[PDB]
Structure 1
Amino acid sequence: TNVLIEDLKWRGLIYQQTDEQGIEDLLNKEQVTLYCGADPTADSLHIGHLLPFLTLRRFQEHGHRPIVLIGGGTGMIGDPSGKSEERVLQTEEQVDKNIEGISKQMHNIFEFGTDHGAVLVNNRDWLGQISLISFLRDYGKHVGVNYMLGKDSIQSRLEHGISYTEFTYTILQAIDFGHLNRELNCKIQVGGSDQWGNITSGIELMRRMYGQTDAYGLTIPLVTKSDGKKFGKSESGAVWLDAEKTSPYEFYQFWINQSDEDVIKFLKYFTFLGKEEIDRLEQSKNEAPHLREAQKTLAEEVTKFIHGEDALNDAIRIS
């Protein structure tokens, strides 16, 4: 037992683990409960997010359980991570509308409603409780200011000027990890490299809150093209996984025009085919490019999956 880790590794979906070995350990020992999430900073997800929720779906394959945290509370605050300009609070309505779009999608990428598997939690439910006073006492007490300015996210912002709220974002997100880690048994939290800071902070908090009751954080790498261009972007902004923001057709082509070079990779990252199916699918590319089979079965997969069998046919027929 170590196949799952064997492939994540093969495909190149592991940019960093907190405890490389220990992760390997429980993953070959007990059926883990891992989660991931997004703040509804919009009403549609987008190729950018498609990667790690897939990685979550690749776990569920082998027996594990994923959980999906929509940004019900941290949404309204905004994660300064990466950013280099303070955020802009959305309106309660907007967020309440945004999470209807963002969730509307997950509910298709995942099968919610089972007796034991995949839960869609809304951190609005617990973060909505904790008060000003409590917060400081119970959690604040154990969050050193010297660790926070440590965060590679904020370090930056600190320079331009970081508001308090972006600054206390990390404590809210850390609170979540522990809460699931306690409430549902979350031991691994998977997220993008833009999430290292936060991932690592959630695990430290519970270390002095109870002595990290067995938590680990994994990070999927970052999608990178060969044309040197901000993957995910189009004059049509970024490829939204919503049919009326980015349609099966526009979707389709995106994948169909995948610069031959950065192809097999994207096959590995985004498609549920084997190393053998891909391997074959690599020859077909290495010496019969006219047929453009790789770049074709890619798009086929991602479009049928994300959009539909029907919306694949409906799409393919526009060349």
Structure 2
Amino acid sequence: TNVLIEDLKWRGLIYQQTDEQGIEDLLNKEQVTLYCGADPTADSLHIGHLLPFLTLRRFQEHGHRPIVLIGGGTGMIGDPSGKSEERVLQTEEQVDKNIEGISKQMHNIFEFGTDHGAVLVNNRDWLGQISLISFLRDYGKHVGVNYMLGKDSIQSRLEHGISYTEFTYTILQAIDFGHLNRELNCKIQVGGSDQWGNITSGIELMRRMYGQTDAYGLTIPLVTKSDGKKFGKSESGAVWLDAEKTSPYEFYQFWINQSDEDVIKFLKYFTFLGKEEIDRLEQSKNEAPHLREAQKTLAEEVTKFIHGEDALNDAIRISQALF
């Protein structure tokens, strides 16, 4: 029937794929379990973390099961992917604090607590049980150094002295994928494009440990602004989902101020509006751009999803007053 795949491609939500036909066939023949993870490096998520998780909700709409992973264990280490400098280690108590904040935001994006619906996992639960010796004998023997060395995600830090610990992070993410595959039949891992290396490590580790070849990876596009500026950065800094760090008004204003060149693409990325309504908004944008109907709709949909009706209205007021 390919309804979901066609929806995803119309929205431009799929960037890299480990096996295009394989994934499409999988999605057409069965109900799939998939996951996306987030490390607790701050006590809130920001809009840059939003697209992959909303995309998991689009899969859920078609009968698939999403798994949201919080990196209680990997967050004690730090992902080097795409970054250029070694990150400082966080304290156990700060990570605990962060997990608590990010967890609350996840409960607002997915409905956890149901018998067979969305699931929230913390990788500290299994990674914290692994000893150094069993890690080297059970998993490390199945990873090649050259394989790890010839990868995108770490050349950036290769040139500037990557530590052995940042170098092994990719294997921890790999262990997570194998664990959810065996425990919850997870067959697909989703993530932003900077995660391509960590995602393929999981697939190759499973292939080497068990000849398991029914696992795939998908990445979501890096979100761009037509002028080339970084998306997700407001006047001060990042646009947080925590109302205490970025107020509903600031959040709402971020959306209402997107350009005409990017607004339709963002309606496709961030809202659950149908194609008919979105096409109507595109015509309105072409015919009556001064009405900003597209931006207004975008701001309302996302602000309500993240902060609720009440906060939206108060943001709509402060906005009418400021100008």
TM-score, with structure 1 as normaliser: 0.99
Q: What displacement does 1:63 show?
A: 0.2
Please list every run of 5 or more consecutive structure 2 residues that lacks an aligned counterpart in the other structure.
Answer: none
* Residue 227 (structure 1) shift: 2.1
More deviation, 32-41/229-238: 229-238
1:213 is displaced (CA, Å) by: 4.5
What percent of counterpart residues are identical?
Answer: 100
Extract unaligned runs of 5+ from structure 1. none
| C-alpha separation in 2, matches of 1:277 and 1:283 | 10
- Is contact 1:227–1:259 with CA below 8 Å preserved after alignment? no
1:156 and 1:43 map into 2 onto residues whose CA distance is 27
Q: Cα deviation per residue 1:42-73 (whole Å; 9 max; x = unaligned)?
A: 00000000111000010000000000110110
Deviations 1:109-138 (CA, angstroms, capped at 9, x unpaired): 000000101100000000001100000000
Partner of 2:141: 141
Counterparts of 1:316 and 1:115, CA distance in 2: 38
Cα distance, 1:150 vs. partner? 1.4
Q: For the Cα contact (< 8 Å) 1:14–1:220, is it kept in 2?
A: yes
- Count of residue pairs the alignment pairs up: 319
Structure 2-normalised TM-score?
0.98
Between the aligned partners of 1:209 and 1:74, the Cα distance in structure 2 is: 21
Shift of residue 159 of structure 1?
A: 0.8
In 2, Cα distance between equivalents of 1:229 and 1:6:
29
Over the residues paired in the alignment, what is the CA RMSD in angstroms?
A: 0.7
Mean Cα deviation higher: 148-157 or 118-127: 148-157
8 A contact 1:270–1:302 mirrored in 2 = yes
The answer on whether the counterparts of 2:234 and 2:254 sit within 8 Å (CA) in structure 1 is: no
Give CA-to-partner distance per residue, 1:276-299, whole Å, 9 cap, x none: 100001011001111110011000
Give deviations 1:117-175, integer Å, cap 9, x for gaps. Answer: 11000000000011000000000001111111112111221111100000010111100
CA distance in structure 2 between the aligned counterparts of 1:8 and 1:286, rounded to whole angstroms: 24
* d(CA) in 1 for partners of 2:312, 2:30: 38
Shift of 1:310: 1.2
Distance 1:239 1:258 in 2: 14
* More divergent stretch after superposition (151-160 vs 166-175): 151-160
Q: Give, in angstroms, the shift of residue 261 of structure 1.
A: 1.0
Alpha-carbon distance in structure 2 between the residues aligned to 1:227 and 1:252: 20
Flag as ranges the 4+ runs of structure 1 deviating above 4 A.
Answer: none
Counterpart residue number, 2:200: 200
The Cα of 1:85 is off from its aligned counterpart by 0.8
Number of the residue aligned with 1:211: 211
Q: CA deviation at 1:178?
A: 0.4
Show the counterpart of 2:130. 130
Question: 1:36 touches 1:190 (CA, 8 Å); kept in 2?
Answer: yes
Deviation for aligned residue 1:194: 0.5
**174-183 or 210-219: bigger deviation:** 210-219
C-alpha distance in structure 2 between counterparts of 1:138 and 1:220, whole Å: 31
Distance 1:239 1:145 in 2: 38
Q: Is the 8 A contact 2:70 2:121 kept in 1?
A: yes
Give the C-alpha shift of residue 236 in structure 1.
2.4
SS at 2:279's partner residue?
helix
